[PDB]
Amino acid sequence: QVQLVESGLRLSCAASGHTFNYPIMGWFRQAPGKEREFVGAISWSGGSTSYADSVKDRFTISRDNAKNTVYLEMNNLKPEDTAVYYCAAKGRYSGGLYYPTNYDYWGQGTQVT
Amino acid sequence: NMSFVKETVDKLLKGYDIRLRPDFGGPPVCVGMNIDIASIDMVSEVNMDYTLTMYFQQYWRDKRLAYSGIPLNLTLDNRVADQLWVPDTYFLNDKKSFVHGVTVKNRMIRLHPDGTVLYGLRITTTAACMMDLRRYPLDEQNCTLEIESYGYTTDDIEFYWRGGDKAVTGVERIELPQFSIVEHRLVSRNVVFATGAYPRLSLSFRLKRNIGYFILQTYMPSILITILSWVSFWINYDASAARVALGITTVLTMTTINTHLRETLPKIPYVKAIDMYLMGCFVFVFLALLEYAFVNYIFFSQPARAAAIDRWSRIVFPFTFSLFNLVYWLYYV
Amino acid sequence: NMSFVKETVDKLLKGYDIRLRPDFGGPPVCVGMNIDIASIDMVSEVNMDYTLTMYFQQYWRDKRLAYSGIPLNLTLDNRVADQLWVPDTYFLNDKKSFVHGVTVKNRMIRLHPDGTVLYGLRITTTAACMMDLRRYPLDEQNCTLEIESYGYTTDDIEFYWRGGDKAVTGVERIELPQFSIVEHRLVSRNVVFATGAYPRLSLSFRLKRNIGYFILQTYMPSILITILSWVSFWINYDASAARVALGITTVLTMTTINTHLRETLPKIPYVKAIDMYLMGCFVFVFLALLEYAFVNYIFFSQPARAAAIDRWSRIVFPFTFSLFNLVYWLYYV
Amino acid sequence: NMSFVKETVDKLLKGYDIRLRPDFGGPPVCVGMNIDIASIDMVSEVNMDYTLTMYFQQYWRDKRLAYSGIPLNLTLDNRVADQLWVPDTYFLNDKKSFVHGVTVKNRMIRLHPDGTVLYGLRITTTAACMMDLRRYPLDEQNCTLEIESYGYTTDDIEFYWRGGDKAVTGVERIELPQFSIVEHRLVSRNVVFATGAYPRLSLSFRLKRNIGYFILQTYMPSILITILSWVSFWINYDASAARVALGITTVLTMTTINTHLRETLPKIPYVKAIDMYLMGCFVFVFLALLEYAFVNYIFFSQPARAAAIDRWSRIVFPFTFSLFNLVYWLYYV
Amino acid sequence: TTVFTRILDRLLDGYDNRLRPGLGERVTEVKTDIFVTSFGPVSDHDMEYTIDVFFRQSWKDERLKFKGPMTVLRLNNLMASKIWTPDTFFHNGKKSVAHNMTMPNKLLRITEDGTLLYTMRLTVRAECPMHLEDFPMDAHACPLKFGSYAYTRAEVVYEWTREPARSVVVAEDGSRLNQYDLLGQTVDSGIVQSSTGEYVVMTTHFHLKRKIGYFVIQTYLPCIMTVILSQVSFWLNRESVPARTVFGVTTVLTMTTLSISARNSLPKVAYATAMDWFIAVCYAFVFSALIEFATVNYFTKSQPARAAKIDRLSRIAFPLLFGIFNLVYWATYLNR
Amino acid sequence: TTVFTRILDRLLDGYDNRLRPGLGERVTEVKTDIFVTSFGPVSDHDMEYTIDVFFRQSWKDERLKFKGPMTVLRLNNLMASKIWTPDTFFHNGKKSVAHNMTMPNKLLRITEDGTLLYTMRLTVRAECPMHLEDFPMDAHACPLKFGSYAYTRAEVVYEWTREPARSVVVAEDGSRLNQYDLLGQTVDSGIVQSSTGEYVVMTTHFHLKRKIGYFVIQTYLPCIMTVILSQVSFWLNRESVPARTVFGVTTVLTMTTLSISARNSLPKVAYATAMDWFIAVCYAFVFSALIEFATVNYFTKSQPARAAKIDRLSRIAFPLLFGIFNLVYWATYLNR
Ligand SMILES: *[C@@H]1O[C@H](CO)[C@@H](O[C@@H]2O[C@H](CO)[C@@H](O[C@@H]3O[C@H](CO[C@H]4O[C@H](CO)[C@@H](O)[C@H](O)[C@@H]4O)[C@@H](O)[C@H](O[C@H]4O[C@H](CO)[C@@H](O)[C@H](O)[C@@H]4O)[C@@H]3O)[C@H](O)[C@H]2NC(C)=O)[C@H](O)[C@H]1NC(C)=O
Ligand SMILES: *[C@@H]1O[C@H](CO)[C@@H](O[C@@H]2O[C@H](CO)[C@@H](O[C@@H]3O[C@H](CO[C@H]4O[C@H](CO)[C@@H](O)[C@H](O)[C@@H]4O)[C@@H](O)[C@H](O[C@H]4O[C@H](CO)[C@@H](O)[C@H](O)[C@@H]4O)[C@@H]3O)[C@H](O)[C@H]2NC(C)=O)[C@H](O)[C@H]1NC(C)=O
Ligand SMILES: *[C@@H]1O[C@H](CO)[C@@H](O[C@@H]2O[C@H](CO)[C@@H](O[C@@H]3O[C@H](CO[C@H]4O[C@H](CO)[C@@H](O)[C@H](O)[C@@H]4O)[C@@H](O)[C@H](O[C@H]4O[C@H](CO)[C@@H](O)[C@H](O)[C@@H]4O)[C@@H]3O)[C@H](O)[C@H]2NC(C)=O)[C@H](O)[C@H]1NC(C)=O
Ligand SMILES: CCCCCCCC/C=C\CCCCCCCC(=O)O[C@@H](COC(=O)CCCCCCCCCCCCCCC)COP(=O)([O-])OCC[N+](C)(C)C
Ligand SMILES: *[C@@H]1O[C@H](CO)[C@@H](O[C@@H]2O[C@H](CO)[C@@H](O)[C@H](O)[C@H]2NC(C)=O)[C@H](O)[C@H]1NC(C)=O
């Protein structure tokens, strides 16, 4: 069981619990008229910060295991960026990365203007 | 009359297209799965995997294999499996697996009058299991086995556990030299790859490493040497040769036993907990020798200050060692 | 209807020449490729290789397999692949590769109404990667996988990454205890041999080695022993036996250090960074012992010169060791 | 004209029945055998086996393959051996065998006008050889290779060495780094199991182990350490620390040498020659230490007796060790 | 020869190998026997053993009755792929090999009444779980269980060819046991149950007793010599303080090294073997010697007569106690 | 589209792959060439080497003449199983691999004149006998010999495609050697004679020279440091008996450990190597230093002048002898 806490631009996702069984953290954004869509994903030792095409070169994702946190730095905000953000945990053999169904635990929503 | 049974079997296989799944173009075919665990041989920390031998059985209904007039189960030769449609079941986290083939290939085909097919295999696999050995040897692991259809999505095939939580059997009788099985769990879900959504079954065990001779043989010598290193402070200026001999002996003995202990630990190149404990003990004996050197140097000019520093060390060293032991116990136990 | 689809497939395979590639004698066939990396089992320096498990998907068009009247994509059995034309793609730098075959051969064939074939395999390959261990353990390793058509030249076949830079996924799934992936890259080019020119694709990874274990196990003990060796400079001549014992202890412990992972390296002829650090530390300890020998030899007739030598050494040795560490960590890092 | 040859070969294999041996139901078929030993790759005491590469040729007559009108010996493709009857020859004491298959399967079929068939294979086989290591490393082994027919008794098949005692070649050109092939022998007999009597051929080698490497590896360090232990008698009896350190170090080094040497051999329950030598050396060094302890026990009250004992031990120990070596090397060499 | 070809063609005409003899009418009785040609090495590290066997089966099949010049047809092994054969497998096997050099090591013989004799040569790696509480003086019973994989007890049964003790025969020269000793075997049969039904199982237990010589001259002798070496220091005069201190510390360190290095041979068990208890008692003896030396040193300057008496008592007490302990330990473990 | 299918069907109509091209009429000529993609590691312990090659053969078969719109048919390797191909094998090979990922790595091309080009990709483990007298400063010539297995010199002969120097081409970056140098190769063609007749064998020798850096930084430097440390003891005052005794004993033990470790990295040859002589001389030096200390301690009580003279003479002489020995050894063996 993993508990995700969201804080925060620069957002922070902090995980507590069996974080070793869910070594991938992903960010999703949800618009009022559209379903949640993938934005970014980070592996603790995979070293592959994956990003969506719409958020390439504008958002960055960093990792640190000192307190088990994932940092999402946002640059060059756009009017379409107004969506509620979520942080989710993905299993080791959970399949694809861009699909919200594969993520087990989700974090509380956060609004960005 | 075996002639009638032969005619029935040949009629069933006549015009049988193995390239089409049952109910092709229609509803998905439900495949039920049972696993009988026979043994778990080696759980390798170096290779991050475990060996598992199982009887893997699948059930599915096929209307093309429905026969009438024979009121018996038909157990056919395993070679008939080369003429029937079978699910493309595979394991995602295995590194090398094989089906036993002595004396013949361990395969079972059983047809039922209502078209039900039971397909059984005896499989030995080496499944990958990533381990978090940062708490070695007081570590707990969660090793899973994943089952999925390689080619058919949920529009064509659906997996489920046949018998609910009593599908996988024989886990209780499994015994390991190091670990002990505490819990096993069965999960059914859907996994979405870039090609589509496939069914998935998961059998996960939780292992807890035992505690015994090795837990004492890796901590007690080091802590005993560190404790003995504190007699240096209670020795007066007279018989200082004994103090020097004690310090040298502590350093040499700790280094020797540390090497002879690391010779047995698993050869993985990242920081475990026992390594940090041994480094802390070595740092403590090094600090004790450094304190002795400083006290001996300042002894002639300021004997009272040297005696006061020895008195301070008498209390400081055990207290700091206990504090560090408490921190280690909180963080890594 | 199943019979209609069976008739369609039989008509497709009827009069089909597997020996001839699509568009034989005409334009080359374009083959797109995708790779989904399951994991990297190990990266071995003794044998200079790495094990890689992947899903390898190929995409091409064969007009002879085009079918009409069915608005569906035919996901056929794996065995059907034995009756079609598939590319002769091979890996130039692999040493032992196999396709997983439990419970069936992990092979997928999918035909499309336009005559478009998708062919998927699950492959475990031990690729050969040559490593430069001059900066070990502060080194980056660039390991590549080469994908080439064996029998067909650039006039017969063409290779490309389907989707561009997104053709290779699963990079984040790779977890190595002693390595961390920094970057991966895709390359496309042509390679000319005596028999002609062939297309070539290349998947490259850049791994970085974790330094925490080496700092914990190698650098810290050596630094502590080097610091301990300087204690003898603050000891009076009356305690000559103490200085002898300290020098011998430091030399012996320095020799004992770093016997933990000898077997997991090849017999390279050059000198690594860790070897350089160990040799420097041993040189410092040996120089301290030699200084003690010289002082003890000369102190009988020239006490003042011996005192001056000791008072100079107790300042020179820490400064020289600090300068050596500065140069080492400024060159290698 | 190749058409006539093709027609002849088609006639030969048209009515041929592969399930029946030549002269089925009649007199037994005689098979002659030749072996050309390419190399004996390795000889292992841990696994109790040796590897052997050979060209293995069999010679028989099948009257169903006799052809006329062609004055040549037809050397056919090796795949033709799949359509012909071949003897079911096996090696009784082999653990892992394989026929080389690069670039094609190493197999030769040669037919003769009178129906004679020559059938050749290139076999690399590991064969079990139980070794009596009681005289190791001055031992002599007798490693055999058994050849037998599995399904055909002496009423159906017969084996003989084709060429008498010259049926095996290449033995003289074998260069084992650690062994010298003293002799090789050929035996032909019958072995009776509960299913009948079968022909048996035996090819045996007598291998003598070169002492060589073992002189520079084990005997010389033991001799040097025993000589080192005698330096104690030349040190003044009031230097207790140095002599005790020397004795303890020699004893521990001898024990470590013996243990680390024995850790690389099968866990035999008996004592080898090298073990006898090491135990003798350990007894000598322990007696030296005991002699020093006795001297130290009475060097206060009776210094003259202690000095006399030291003088006598300066002579008795080397003489006794020389006698021990003489007896050992005249008993084992 | 053509007559036999006609007979074989007639026998194989209309034959369906997918059906067992007496399908739906009776039970297929398979008489089985084993000739062990080499009882290979036993690997206590992996808890397994290797064995080379001639595996023989015999059963009736009325479809293969013939009448010709000969009474028994000793056919090529490929005929085994043309008729029905039992799917016998070994329950505790790990990775078995059916030898294929130079040809499939199988033989098929057909009697005129339909009897089939089918023999093969196999190498079997079987699991042998071990209880290493009496190591190295332990004994084991390594099992070998085989039976049908797909046919239940209502379809195929297994019987031993002759009396059960005479059905598994071990060759006189075929013993590759470096470390253990084969004391015999016990042969039995029974019924097993599983989710697929009830099956007949034939079981053979091979009794092994480990040979202790290697461990006696590998671990016991170094420990005994280290204890004797530690007790040697009681004879040095009390002025040789550094010498006795070196004796004590070196013996303690050597004992610790021997205790640590004695667990590499064994698999990673959790309990303690007999060798562990012996090493523990030797460690206790060495530490007691060191403590006795410390006590003697403490009383040197106060009551020298008392220290001398302590040394005199120790010089007799320590060897006598160690000898009594050795006698008790070996009497307890060698008579169990 | 169907034109090529008809051509291929006409080519194989009545073809017999059991018969070599020109059986009973002439001698088939096979032109061979080798492209070494990577020269693999060398195992001196097992006395073998590994090599990855593209192996090309070309010959003439009149049965495959055709006329069509194209000139060369670059067919799938499956066709190669329906025609005659040479049974080339490597005489000194141990266990080679024909790579099958993802398909069998073979190519077949048929020209309109009947010429056949057949290429494959192989990994060959070959035997390379080694003479380790000059170890670790030795040179080797690893052979690779290949030829026909069943066809004698009167049926099938082998030739190089171009001049033998340029018929074996090594890739620039194809070098997996760790402790060797690939100086070059020599290519020859000869005749061997076995019990079944005379065959043509093509031979390629690869010349290798062992790099000395590993053994310089693994054995020579520790031996030199041990000798220097042992000779340091000559500068200590004669009254420090335990210090010099510890120096001597530790240096002798280090010499023994180095000897055992260095001799445990080679095949168990029965002759002494250069490294063995170096270690023997270093051991002699260390033992000589210890004997010198013992002699000094013998005379330190009755003849102090002799002891001081011995100490001074040893200080002068030991470094000089060790230096001249090192110079002579290196001059002798570097110009071997
Ligand atoms: C080793 O580590 C693995 C993870 O790596 C653990 O596996 C997880 O196990 C838990 C159960 O302990 C699983 O949780 C369960 O998943 C079921 C499947 O979820 C799918 O279907 C639902 C819809 O039904 C989707 O929403 C979802 O996305 C999936 O597609 C659920 O059905 C379960 O829900 C049930 O319980 C919850 C309360 O827990 C109720 O609220 C529900 O109503 C319902 O009754 C449940 O969520 C989890 O999916 C597993 N993850 C993976 C990746 O396998 C192993 O348990 C662990 N080993 C051990 C021994 O602990
Ligand atoms: C591990 O190490 C390998 C090498 O051993 C690295 O692989 C190299 O990667 C670089 C890219 O990072 C490759 O360079 C690129 O090659 C492309 C193909 O070149 C072929 O075609 C051109 C003509 O189009 C020929 O001249 C050439 O000889 C080849 O036949 C080029 O198209 C690329 O050009 C792009 O960059 C250049 C500047 O470099 C621009 O001028 C161009 O306009 C264009 O933008 C480029 O040159 C290189 O070929 C690879 N080497 C090999 C041997 O394949 C791996 O990258 C490395 N791993 C990591 C992680 O870095
Ligand atoms: C590269 O080379 C490797 C071999 O080194 C090939 O692997 C072989 O692949 C073929 C084709 O699939 C296999 O042949 C088939 O084997 C089936 C049984 O396999 C099982 O049992 C064997 C032992 O008997 C195991 O080694 C194996 O792992 C399996 O457990 C047979 O049932 C098949 O029979 C078919 O053909 C016969 C022909 O007489 C017919 O009588 C049958 O009715 C049926 O049609 C068939 O023989 C072969 O076993 C594989 N060998 C190995 C060692 O794996 C690769 O396929 C090859 N790569 C490519 C691309 O071709
Ligand atoms: C560098 C060298 C370092 C090493 C040291 C070198 C030393 C050199 C000096 C001497 C070496 C002598 C070697 C002798 C070897 C004998 C082997 C033997 O007997 O094997 C037999 C077994 O053996 C036993 O069963 C013995 C059990 C009783 C041992 C009693 C010891 C008492 C010690 C009292 C001490 C008191 C001290 C008091 C205080 C002073 C046969 O082996 P097997 O085939 O297994 O037979 C089956 C047995 N089984 C059926 C019973 C299971
Ligand atoms: C076919 O093979 C046979 C057997 O090797 C050849 O007969 C041999 O001929 C040589 C000629 O020098 C004699 O030395 C042998 O003694 C003969 N052996 C036998 C068994 O006859 C025969 O010549 C070969 N045929 C051809 C055409 O070469």
CA distance F59 to F117: 7
**Six-digit token string for C53:** 């498990």
Chain E: residue whose CA lies nearest to D300: E237
Decide whether any atom of ligand 4 lies within 6 Å of the D121 Cβ: no
Q: How many Å lie between the centroid of ligand 5 and the Cα of residue F195?
A: 12
Decide whether any atom of ligand 4 lies within 6 Å of the E319 Cβ: yes
> Please, which residues have CB within 8 angstroms of residue F252's CB and are 6 or more apart in sequence?
D224, D228, F283, F286, F287, F290
Count the Cβ atoms, other than its own, within 10 Å of residue E87. Answer: 21
Write down the H helix ranges in C204-302. 212-214, 220-229, 240-256, 273-298
Is the dihedral angle over the CA atoms E238, E248, B225, C221 positive or is it negative? positive
**Six-digit token string for A18:** 């069996």
Roughly how many angstroms between the first and final C-alpha of chain F, as a whole number?
A: 67
Phi, psi torsion values for E197, nearest 5 degrees: 135, -160
**Which residue do the tokens 């005489």 mark?**
F91
Nearest partner of B144 among B97, B184, B99, judged by Cα? B184
- The amino acid sitting at A4 is L
**Six-digit token string for B62:** 């096929």
Q: How many Å lie between the centroid of ligand 1 and the Cα of residue A89?
A: 13
CA distance B181 to B183: 6
List of chain B residues whose C-beta atoms are within 8 Å of the C-beta of residue C256: 255-256, 259
Judge whether E232 and E246 are in contact, CB under 8 Å: no
**Which residue do the tokens 């090094």 mark?**
B286
Q: Are strands C29-44 and C107-111 parallel, antiparallel or unpaired?
A: unpaired
B88·C104 Cβ contact <8 A: yes
List of chain A residues whose C-beta atoms are within 8 Å of the C-beta of residue C173: 43, 46, 92
The interface residues of chain B toward chain E in range 110-149, judged by CB-CB distance below 8 A, are 110, 118, 120, 122, 124
Nearest partner of B269 among E191, D215, C177, C33, judged by Cα? C177
CA distance D151 to E108: 7
Judge whether C141 and C206 are in contact, CB under 8 Å: yes
> Please, which residues have CB within 8 angstroms of residue A7's CB and are 6 or more apart in sequence?
A14
Q: Which H, E and C letters describe F245-282, residue by residue? A: HHHHHHHHHHHHHHHHHHHCCCCCCCCCCHHHHHHHHH
CA distance D329 to E306: 52
**Domain that includes residue A14, residue range:** 2-111
**Six-digit token string for F261:** 């470790």
Q: How many Å lie between the centroid of ligand 2 and the Cα of residue C163?
A: 19
C76 Cα to chain B: minimum distance (Å)? 6
Phi, psi torsion values for B162, nearest 5 degrees: -90, 100
Count the Cβ atoms, other than its own, within 10 Å of residue F203. Answer: 18
Nearest partner of D193 among E186, E169, E118, judged by Cα? E169
The distance between the two most distant Cα atoms of chain D, rounded to a whole number of Å, is 112
What is the architecture of the domain spanning C212-331? Up-down Bundle (1.20)
> Please, which residues have CB within 8 angstroms of residue E317's CB and are 6 or more apart in sequence?
none
Same fold for the pair D2-209 and D213-332: no
CA distance E283 to E257: 11
Q: Which residues line ligand 5 (CB under 6 A)?
A: D 71-73, 112
* Residue C108 burial class via C-beta count within 10 angstroms: exposed 0-12, middle 13-18, buried 19 and up: buried
Q: Are strands F168-170 and F28-43 parallel, antiparallel or unpaired?
A: parallel
Judge whether A45 and C176 are in contact, CB under 8 Å: yes
CA distance F223 to F251: 10
Is the dihedral angle over the CA atoms E10, E16, E20, E25 positive or is it negative? negative
CA C147 from centre of chain: 17
Measure CB to CB from residue A96 to each of B92, B142, B194 and give the nearest one: B194
CA distance F226 to F212: 20
Nearest partner of B115 among B81, B156, B73, judged by Cα? B73
C296·F237 Cβ contact <8 A: yes
Judge whether C201 and C214 are in contact, CB under 8 Å: no
CA distance F26 to F184: 36
Decide whether any atom of ligand 4 lies within 6 Å of the E216 Cβ: yes
Judge whether B92 and B60 are in contact, CB under 8 Å: no
CA distance E318 to E295: 15
**Which residue do the tokens 């050059």 mark?**
C270
E213-334, superfamily in CATH? Neurotransmitter-gated ion-channel transmembrane domain (1.20.58.390)
Specify the DSSP class assigned to residue C78.
G
Q: E strands, chain C, where?
A: 29-44, 49-61, 74-76, 89-91, 94-99, 107-111, 116-128, 140-149, 157-161, 168-169, 179-193, 196-209
Kindly list the strands in the beta sheet with E182-194, ordered across the sheet, starting from the edge strand earlier in the chain: E88-90, E139-148, E197-209, E182-194
Nearest partner of A31 among A106, A111, A102, A97, judged by Cα? A111
- CATH 3.40.605.10 assigned to domain F2-211? The reply is no
Is the dihedral angle over the CA atoms A41, A42, A46, A47 positive or is it negative? positive
CATH number, span E2-209: 2.70.170.10
Decide whether any atom of ligand 3 lies within 6 Å of the F101 Cβ: no
Specify the DSSP class assigned to residue E226.
H
Polymer length in residues for chain C:
333
Chain C: residue whose CA lies nearest to A92: C173
List of chain D residues whose C-beta atoms are within 8 Å of the C-beta of residue F124: 102
Count the Cβ atoms, other than its own, within 10 Å of residue C311. Answer: 12
Decide whether any atom of ligand 3 lies within 6 Å of the F100 Cβ: yes
D2-209, superfamily in CATH? Neurotransmitter-gated ion-channel ligand-binding domain (2.70.170.10)
List of chain B residues whose C-beta atoms are within 8 Å of the C-beta of residue A92: 130
Q: How many Å lie between the centroid of ligand 2 and the Cα of residue C188?
A: 8
List of chain B residues whose C-beta atoms are within 8 Å of the C-beta of residue E194: 36, 55
The A-side interface with C (CB below 8 A) comprises: 23-24, 41-43, 45-48, 50, 92, 97
Judged by its nearest atom, the ligand closest to the C-alpha of residue C93 is: 2
Counting ligand 2 atoms within 8 A of each CB, the residue from C186, C193, C200, C204 with the most, and so the one to mutate, is C204
CA distance C233 to C70: 92
List of chain C residues whose C-beta atoms are within 8 Å of the C-beta of residue A51: none
> Please, which residues have CB within 8 angstroms of residue B290's CB and are 6 or more apart in sequence?
C228, C231
Q: Is B90 annotated as a binding residue?
A: yes
Burial C223-233, CB ≥16 within 10 A → b, else e: ebbbebbbbbb
Decide whether any atom of ligand 1 lies within 6 Å of the B189 Cβ: yes
Judge whether D205 and D181 are in contact, CB under 8 Å: yes
B190·A21 Cβ contact <8 A: no
**Six-digit token string for E229:** 């070496």
Q: How many Å lie between the centroid of ligand 1 and the Cα of residue B187?
A: 6
CA distance C161 to C165: 8
Resolution in angstrom units: 3.2
Burial F266-291, CB ≥16 within 10 A → b, else e: bebbbebbbbbebbebbbebbbebbe
CATH number, span F214-334: 1.20.58.390
Candidates C103, C162, C252, C258: best to mutate against B (most CBs of B within 10 A) is C103
Judged by its nearest atom, the ligand closest to the C-alpha of residue F24 is: 5
Residue bearing the CA closest to ligand 4, atom 9:
D279
Return the axis-axis angle of helices E221-232 and E241-261, rounded to nearest 10°.
Answer: 160
B151·C41 Cβ contact <8 A: no
CA distance D312 to E259: 39
Judge whether E134 and E206 are in contact, CB under 8 Å: no
Is the dihedral angle over the CA atoms D235, D241, D244, D247 positive or is it negative? negative
- The amino acid sitting at F169 is V
Nearest partner of A39 among A23, A50, A31, A24, judged by Cα? A50
Which helix (DSSP H) or strand (DSSP E) does residue E275 occupy? helix E274-298
Judge whether D288 and D247 are in contact, CB under 8 Å: yes
CATH number, span D213-332: 1.20.58.390
Phi, psi torsion values for F50, nearest 5 degrees: -120, 145
Decide whether any atom of ligand 4 lies within 6 Å of the E258 Cβ: no
CA distance E32 to F218: 60
If one counts the domains in chain A, the total is 1
Judge whether D113 and D68 are in contact, CB under 8 Å: yes
D17·E1 Cβ contact <8 A: yes
Q: Where in chain E is the domain with CATH 2.70.170.10?
A: 2-209
Neighbours of chain A (3+ CB pairs under 8 A): B, C
Q: Are strands E72-75 and E197-209 parallel, antiparallel or unpaired?
A: unpaired
- The amino acid sitting at B116 is T
Chain B: residue whose CA lies nearest to C238: B241
CA distance E33 to E164: 9
Count the Cβ atoms, other than its own, within 10 Å of residue C266. Answer: 16
Q: Does D42 touch chain F if contact means CB atoms closer than 8 Å?
A: yes
C2 Cα to chain F: minimum distance (Å)? 30
Q: Is C59 annotated as a binding residue?
A: no
Decide whether any atom of ligand 1 lies within 6 Å of the B130 Cβ: no
Return the axis-axis angle of helices E274-298 and E221-232, rounded to nearest 10°.
Answer: 10
**Six-digit token string for B51:** 């060996």
CA separation, residue D37 to residues C139, F148, F275 (Å): 48, 18, 34
Is the dihedral angle over the CA atoms F288, F293, F294, F295 positive or is it negative? positive
Decide whether any atom of ligand 3 lies within 6 Å of the F103 Cβ: yes
CATH number at residue A101: 2.60.40.10
E103 Cα to chain D: minimum distance (Å)? 5
Instruction: Spell out the domain ranges in chain D.
Output: 2-209, 213-332
Judge whether E47 and E267 are in contact, CB under 8 Å: yes
The A-side interface with B (CB below 8 A) comprises: 18, 20-21, 92-96, 99, 101-102
Judged by its nearest atom, the ligand closest to the C-alpha of residue E104 is: 3
Question: Which residues partner with E116 through β-bridges?
Answer: E59, E110
Q: E strands, chain D, where?
A: 29-39, 43-44, 49-61, 74-76, 89-90, 94-99, 107-111, 116-128, 140-149, 157-161, 168-169, 179-193, 196-209
- Chains D and C: 3 or more CB pairs within 8 Å of each other: no
Decide whether any atom of ligand 3 lies within 6 Å of the F335 Cβ: no
Experimental method: cryo-EM
Phi, psi torsion values for C229, nearest 5 degrees: -65, -25
CA distance F116 to D297: 93
CA distance B31 to B159: 5
